[PDB]
Every structure is written in structure tokens, then in C-alpha cells.
Amino acid sequence: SMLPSISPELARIAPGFRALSINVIAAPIRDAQVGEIALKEACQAVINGQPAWAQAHIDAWNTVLKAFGAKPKRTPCSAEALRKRVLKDGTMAALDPVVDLYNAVSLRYAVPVGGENSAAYCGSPRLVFADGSETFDTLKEGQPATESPEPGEVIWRDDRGVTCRRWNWRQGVRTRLSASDKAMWFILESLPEMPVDELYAAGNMLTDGLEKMMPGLRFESTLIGV
């Protein structure tokens, strides 16, 4: 299992940050439409203006992003990127039943949600300030590419290198999640502007959908923070 750690230095810019770290052992898919349906209903919820804390939570993330030098309009947190696409098109496209499910959670609860193949990790995830020498494997023009984060940028990383740039802006390719992964790691990331009871409810939507999708699936969820 994966035991994430957060550098105490992050309290300088994001005091009161809290996240659910959820380790999953998957099972064969038996209800493949779970993700599609949750996503369709999440898009309507957003179009209907839900949830109530969305603007305050997104604003709080944008303050955080600015605090480590990022331009949030150009490189938004994952929650805002999804919300803007739903409010521009009225819907969002399928990709994979598990990705659709966790994007649906992110939309319904206005909360950044990451999902990764935990078998691809070397060591445990850590949330730290980057020094600019780290490697990040990504896509430049649809093909594999490598780049480095900015000095002082907040990153998730393992022993090899960066696994998510600018806190929750862009996941790397190496640890990308697929519905056929035998071992998954999700991180649902929040600031005080989101009520902690709603974070618990987002995690409960996620694990319920995963279990309906894959009967026999098991999870371990831990509240972490700085």
C-alpha cells in the first residue's frame, strides 16, 4: 500500500489543506456504465449551479496556485478545468469508465480528484516544493516528452520523478490510470473553503461507484493534511 507524505513547508501557502488518499485493489468489471451515468448526472448538477461551495473552493485553489508562482488562468486546477468544459459544452466525453467516474466526483463536489496506477509508482507519493531539476514525463504533441517543473513549483512525486505538476494541474503519463489496473490510488484534495463533511461524501460517491462497477473491489482511505 501507498503512504503519502506532505512537506510541512506547504503550510506556508495552504494551511488547513486536507485530502483523502484512497488505495484500491480492483476487481473484474461487471457494471461498465457506472462511470458514464454518474458523469452525465454530474454535468447536469453543475449546469444546475451545484455545488454551493464551488466558486469559493475554486477561488481558494487559485490563490494557492498563485502562491507558488503559477498563472491559474493558464494552468488551472483539475476541478476548474472540468467545470469550465461542462459550462462551455453542456457535456463531457467518455474516455474510460473509471476516469469518467472520478471526473464525475470532481464535478459534483467541485473538488480536485486525481487517479493513478499505483503499480507504476517507485516509492511512495510525496507532496513537496520542486527545485527545478526533477523530470516529468508528459505529452508535448501527442507523443511522449520530458520536461522539468519550475523551481518552487508544488509537485507530487515518487522516487523517480514528478507524477503531477502544479499540485493538481496535470498528471504525468507514467502513472496514468486505466480501468484495467489491478491497483489504483486516488487523491481527493480540498481546502477549508470546502466543508470537510462534503469531502467525506465525495469519497463515498467514489468508492460506491467503484464497488458497483467492480464487485469485490476493496479500498483503504486515509485523511491527510498540512
Added chain:
Amino acid sequence: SMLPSISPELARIAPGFRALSINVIAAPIRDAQVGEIALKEACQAVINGQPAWAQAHIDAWNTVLKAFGAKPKRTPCSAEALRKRVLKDGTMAALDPVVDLYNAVSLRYAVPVGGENSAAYCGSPRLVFADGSETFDTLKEGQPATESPEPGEVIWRDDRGVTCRRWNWRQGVRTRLSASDKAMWFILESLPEMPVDELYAAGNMLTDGLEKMMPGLRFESTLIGV
């Protein structure tokens, strides 16, 4: 570090089961009244008809018990065991300050709560379907006895044998918790009919109480589920 595991097959009879697993390293008891006050106030709360989800949760647990062959009228879950006694007898007898506090959590939040001496475990706890050959050290009319669970009975067990029969109906003698224990394991077991934010609230009542009773105590909390 007790690392409980649960069998994938439990999803077939208790889809959406989730339990808060709390590992505790005790400290000296500086305020032994913590358990006694919590239990009195919890009995009062049950008399007033709290909490809202009690009926639905106990009903769902009875559904799960019948699904593996038990007679909940003869062998209720531990939460209804306590609730029935308070409603029938107006109060509940003190036993031990740590036992009193965790029974109070069960009463106030209408959730089965197990408390055990983790130093008495041989290996790690596991939640499995019994095959009927395991052994279980219990009491018959006050006097020590050995039983075996039914084939298909859901049990908590360790390397030696059963530590709780019929999921959360009756703990064994071997791993009974006492206030003087140096290492303690609590399991607060819930079904979807209990709102998950109230399960976290129950956990916080328990760890806030333990921290007041034993300043300097350490704990780690993990939500596990199927």
C-alpha cells in the same frame, strides 16, 4: 500496526460495507471520568430517540446477519444489544473507562464498535467467511468454553482462530480490551444506511475522548471497505 484485511466476497452480501479502523498506543489515564460522562449522556440521547439513522442501520445489519444464516432476534449486532438494554433498563452499567467510552460511541451513533487488546492478536485481523473448523474461546453461563462458528458465518479471526463470531455479535475472551492495555484496536463497522460523515463523527468522539482521558496518546485511523 494492526493491518486488517477483508475478503472480496463480502461485497456479495454487504455491498458498501465500510469500517473505521483505529490503532491506538495508550498513555496514562489522567481523567477516568471521560468514559463515565460520555456513557451517561449517550444513554440520555438514546432515550430521546437519537440518532436519526438508528432504525435503518440496525435493520440493514439484521439483513446482513440473516444473509449468512444467523437469527438476529437471538444474536443481534452489538449496537442493538446495547440500544435494547438502555431502552429496557433506563441506563447502562459502567464497566471500565475505555469500555464505557467506546460503548457510548456505539450508543450515540448507533454503530457497532469493537474494542480489543491488540497485543493479544497472533498475526493480523481478517474478516472472512468461516468454514466451520475454526475455534472460538468464549463463555457459557460465566464459565470458559470453546465453540466453532457455522460454515458460512462471517467472522473476525487471527492466526489462532475466531476473535468475533457473527461479524459483530460476540467477541472472544482472549482479545478483550481493558483500560490498562498499552496497544488497542477499535473497529467501527457500518453499512450505507449510516451517513459516512456521521461515521467520521463517531470516530472523532472516540479519539477526542481517548485523548482527553490519556494525554499523549497516539492513534492512526483508516477507513476500509468493500
